[PDB]
């Protein structure tokens, strides 16, 4: 064809049951992870002379919700530049026309692992608090851009062996806040719940609230933390409220019982203090009613976290988001495909 000459910019490699077709600069692809949206490889970028990560997203325009999330991810990864948010190095599609376009490849800095194996390590307070600080800095930065995540979880947070941390994406069941799973309103501190779930899991090993489904998720939460107040119940839609109220009246456990000293270090007065501080922060993050839950700014000032505080990191000015791109405007699926294709072709280096 007329555009067929473009194909020579790329080559293909089989990765499991998928073909990766990438720019020739990216060499020796190897799988490093998988999620729902994409398959991720490590590669050597011969132009930058460094290793990178490459995520393949197929058919990001499959419906309006998927398309909005994908477009927002491209826009935000481009305009955001913060040490605790994964950076965009390149984006491309190997297909040569709008009609043939299906796959988007996002090239990022290569981190070493996701937070999953860290959670199972024996972490001291120094490493736990620094990881949590970094997560809070990244979340604060997103919130300052008008971006509330709602879906933070260990698989979308990555680390390096120097204990640095970056969040992989920009959001929208074990880690989702009550207000998300129950379809209520939400505000910024929706993301504090998820931080609390991850912190709690670092200490307890097991997922705190391992619901087998939606209602089971709620049951795990109230069994541990107690049935919420009538003030909370009145904020529920009528059908949801009937469910939520139609079960046993759990009182919950104290945070001393949920997170006893035996799960923390006890070799010193310093560590005794830090166990108490960690438990105190957990008691302020793992709060069902968001109106009584700590904010991100308050968490960053909490003594457990604040030892790491640096305003150049926590108060970095927000990105300039380009006009309308992060709108609430709606579009047909064909229009969404066109918008994403245009963004991909514009963004490529």
């Amino acid at each position: 064809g007329s555009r067929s000459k473009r194909d020579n910019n790329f080559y293909s490699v089989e990765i499991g049951d998928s073909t990766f077709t990438v720019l020739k600069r990216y060499q020796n692809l190897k799988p490093i992870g998988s999620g729902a949206q994409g398959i991720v490889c490590a590669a050597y970028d011969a132009i930058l002379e460094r290793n990178v990560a490459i995520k393949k997203l197929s058919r990001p325009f499959q419906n309006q919700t998927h398309a909005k999330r994908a477009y927002r991810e491209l826009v935000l990864m481009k305009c955001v530049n913060h040490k605790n948010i994964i950076g965009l190095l390149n984006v491309f599609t190997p297909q040569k026309s709008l009609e043939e376009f299906q796959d988007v490849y996002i090239v990022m800095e290569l981190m070493d692992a996701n937070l999953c194996q860290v959670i199972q390590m024996e972490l001291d307070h120094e490493r736990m608090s620094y990881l949590l600080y970094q997560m809070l800095c990244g979340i604060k930065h997103l919130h300052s851009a008008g971006i509330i995540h709602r879906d933070l979880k260990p698989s979308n947070i990555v680390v390096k062996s120097d204990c640095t941390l970056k969040i992989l994406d920009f959001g929208l069941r074990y880690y989702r806040a009550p207000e998300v799973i129950l379809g209520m309103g939400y505000k910024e501190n929706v993301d504090i719940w998820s931080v609390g779930c991850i912190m709690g899991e670092m200490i307890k090993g097991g997922v705190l609230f391992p619901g087998t489904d939606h209602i089971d998720q709620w049951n795990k939460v109230i069994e541990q933390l107690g049935t919420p107040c009538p003030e909370f119940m009145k904020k529920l839609q009528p059908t949801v409220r009937t469910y939520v109220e139609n079960r046993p009246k759990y009182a919950g456990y104290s945070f001393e019982k949920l997170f006893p000293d035996v799960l923390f270090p006890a070799d010193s007065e310093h560590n005794k203090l830090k166990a108490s501080q960690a438990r105190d922060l957990l008691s302020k993050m793992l709060v069902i009613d968001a109106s009584k839950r700590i904010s991100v700014d308050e968490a960053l000032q909490h003594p457990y976290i604040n030892v790491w505080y640096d305003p150049s990191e926590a108060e970095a000015p927000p990105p300039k988001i380009p006009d309308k791109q992060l709108d609430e405007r709606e579009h047909t699926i064909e229009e969404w495909k066109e918008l994403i294709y245009k963004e991909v072709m514009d963004l490529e280096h």
Binding site: D112, Q117, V118, R127, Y130, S161, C163
Partner: peptide, 12 residues
């Protein structure tokens, strides 16, 4: 009381 450059995660 480590400096940040002394925090190490033994990832595998």
């Amino acid at each position: 009381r480590p400096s940040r450059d002394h925090l190490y995660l033994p990832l595998e």
